[PDB]
């Protein structure tokens, strides 16, 4: 099966950074844009941006620029989301989801289980 395995919960303090991982199996991430989605507690889904692991090209919504960095390592079939200078506004569950012709061509049919990040002293 197509699977997305995300890294485990994080409990970190204000000002720190975290790097979350999303490991794919069942397909080559080079066949898919790897998207990241933010969900604050009690709130909706927000697109952060995506990477094309075939060439490392990312896109970021303006409000996440300088905050979020998305990268990929095709040798381990993994995509990453790094978040720096963390504030409580960053407290959220973060999801990865592939989008691509040979895996999920129409919408986001496959989602990781999400990684919770909690920012507090």
């Amino acid at each position: 099966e197509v699977q997305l395995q995300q890294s485990g919960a994080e409990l970190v303090e204000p000002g720190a950074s975290v790097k979350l991982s999303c490991t794919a199996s069942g397909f080559n991430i080079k066949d898919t844009y790897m998207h990241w989605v933010k969900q604050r507690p009690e709130q909706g889904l927000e697109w952060i941006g995506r990477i094309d692991p075939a060439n490392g090209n990312s896109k970021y919504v303006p409000k996440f620029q300088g905050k979020a960095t998305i990268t990929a390592d095709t040798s381990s079939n993994t995509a990453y989301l790094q978040l720096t200078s963390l504030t409580s506004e960053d407290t959220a569950v973060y999801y990865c989801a592939p989008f691509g012709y040979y895996v999920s061509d129409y919408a986001m049919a496959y989602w990781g289980q999400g990684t919770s990040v909690t920012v507090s002293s």
Partner: protein, 111 residues
């Protein structure tokens, strides 16, 4: 970016009844007539799950009690009959254009 607005914010229904909900886009999301508007089910504590893509196409494995209509700016998700498994927040998403955007959710509860 294309704003998606969902109504109602929450709905409580009886088991076996009909539930319907609205997703309205502030700009058209059609591509050659087809709405690039998808519906996700997010059960409590779980990731979103794809129900329907491009307005009315059910993903395999989604039961036929689910259906969707719409084009351009006005979309509808229908669940009939509502079953206990269907407790969730339902989201619409457009992929007509970057950045991908999502509606605010309709939280479905059973009374």
């Amino acid at each position: 970016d294309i704003v998606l607005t969902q109504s109602p914010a929450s709905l409580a229904v009886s088991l076996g009844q009909r539930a319907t909900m609205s997703c309205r886009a502030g700009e058209s999301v059609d591509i050659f007539g087809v709405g690039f508007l998808h519906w996700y089910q997010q059960k409590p504590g779980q990731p979103p799950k794809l129900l329907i893509y491009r307005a009315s196409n059910l993903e395999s494995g989604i039961p036929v009690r689910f259906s969707g209509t719409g084009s351009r700016t006005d979309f509808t998700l229908i669940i009939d009959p509502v079953e206990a498994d269907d407790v969730a927040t339902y989201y619409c998403q457009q992929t007509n254009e970057d950045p991908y955007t999502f509606g605010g959710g309709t939280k479905l509860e059973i009374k």
